[PDB]
Design an enzyme around this catalytic site. Structure first.
Site: not given
Ligand SMILES: *S(=O)(=O)c1cccc(S(=O)(=O)Nc2cc(C3=CCCC3)ccc2C(=O)OC)c1
Ligand SMILES: *S(=O)(=O)c1cccc(S(=O)(=O)Nc2cc(C3=CCCC3)ccc2C(=O)OC)c1
Ligand SMILES: [Cl-]
Lengths: 231, 231
Positions: A9-10, A14, A21-22, A60, A87, A184-185
């Site tokens: 999904h895109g 949130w 979101s999780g 989503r 997710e 989900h990814g």
């Molecule tokens: S996940 O794939 O659903 C998700 C949600 C929101 C953001 C990301 S990210 O692109 O990987 N950036 C990111 C991830 C994390 C994580 C902590 C727990 C596991 C992943 C922390 C910080 C960041 C961030 O970009 O810092 C500013 C993935």
């Protein structure tokens, strides 16, 4: 032999607030809905057909599937929803934006959590603003205490997705059913890792495109005969 | 007392063309889609919660269900689709309007087919314009030769809908699962006739409103403790 299609999904509501979101049941954003429309159109243009669809219990992904089925005129297909394709559960980070996360938890922990295959974020505790909303949601009433996560590593997510792949999806593929998985990814990462025998390092570097059908051609042992292709 | 809710879809694209739809998979009209939204909001305002949903393999019912689930924030519910909740199969009348039907088949037969409980419309023959579209649709590929209708009386429709009621819906009600059925007027008539023990003339005089949740309170024997009530 077998043909398998995945779609991630895109963008979500949130994502618009840069919030984790999780398991929070955020809807698709307008752009996420548009992405699902484009993926459905790509499947339509290539003449893809399915026999059964799997998705999560999060709107989503469900709405992405609905949009794809509408586009390919296959709204009649059987749909199976499972929390096991949800997710990754982002624990206490749920609902926080990037700045709140950095301020509360610090740069060092964030870097570890982001780059690690097997270290989880903090648990979502009962005083968390979304604990009641997620952990006391009646859609998880049938989960055991141990199955309901308070948080997940990527390894955890993959570990609870693959039993559903093995028990529910693989038998459909072996019967020759053409499967579409809309999820989900991170749950899709588990399936890709299993299909290709990818390393932890490789799967953490795999960023599956959103709204783009991911096409596998599998031999009789469900081994890919060629790299994944994007429609 | 168990609570069961039925909803009949609203106006379709072929209603606007004044054409007999039957098993032709006509979509909702915009007005029929808005009807489903208002029905969904009525259920939302009354606080209704469901556990499982049943619908047909026809998009005008599936879309009504999708719209209701969206409105009540229950898109995660399991959904089961079945040809047995389809509209009556209008046979050779499929695709015709009232004037074409009267010209080809005459006023005497039309009157009979319209007021009769058990006289079917003419069969849809292999040279019918929609024969391949309906009879060779792969969504019916698992029906036997004997099961695939070329036409249905109301009695026929009720006769293949009630096996699904007993096979898949009754077990859910007995387990206390709160059921929502989104289907078609004539397949819902089969459930109402069975629940209240109505005569053929009573069920044929009963016109179920579109887009209005129909609420049954059932005792431990799945017998209504009072007649259906409209929300
Ligand atoms: S996940 O794939 O659903 C998700 C949600 C929101 C953001 C990301 S990210 O692109 O990987 N950036 C990111 C991830 C994390 C994580 C902590 C727990 C596991 C992943 C922390 C910080 C960041 C961030 O970009 O810092 C500013 C993935
Ligand atoms: S059916 O309930 O899906 C349906 C579709 C369109 C119109 C009608 S009607 O209002 O009952 N009028 C009608 C029905 C029929 C039937 C032949 C097979 C079963 C019903 C014949 C004629 C007419 C009509 O009104 O002729 C003037 C129901
Ligand atoms: Cl669905």
């Amino acid at each position: 032999a077998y043909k398998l299609v995945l779609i991630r999904h895109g963008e979500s509501a949130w994502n618009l607030e840069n919030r984790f979101s999780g398991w929070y049941d955020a809807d698709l954003s307008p752009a996420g809905h548009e992405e699902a429309k484009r993926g459905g159109q790509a499947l339509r243009d290539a003449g893809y057909e399915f026999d059964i669809c799997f998705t999560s219990v999060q709107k989503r992904a469900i709405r992405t599937l609905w949009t794809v089925l509408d586009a390919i005129d296959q709204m009649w297909l059987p749909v199976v929803r499972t929390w096991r394709l949800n997710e990754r559960h982002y624990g206490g980070l749920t609902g926080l934006n990037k700045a709140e996360t950095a301020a509360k938890h610090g740069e060092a922990q964030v870097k570890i959590w982001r780059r690690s295959y097997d270290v989880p974020p903090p648990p979502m505790e009962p005083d968390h603003p979304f604990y009641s909303n997620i952990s006391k949601d009646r859609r998880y009433a049938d989960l055991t205490e141990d199955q309901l996560p308070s948080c997940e590593s990527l390894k955890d997510t993959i570990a609870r997705a693959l039993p559903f792949w093995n028990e529910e999806i693989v038998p459909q593929i072996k019967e020759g059913k053409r499967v579409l998985i809309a999820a989900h990814g991170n749950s899709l990462r588990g399936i890709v890792k299993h299909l290709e025998g990818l390393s932890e390092e490789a799967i953490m570097e795999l960023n599956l495109p959103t709204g783009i059908p991911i096409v596998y051609e599998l031999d009789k042992n469900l081994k890919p005969i060629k790299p994944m292709q994007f429609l």
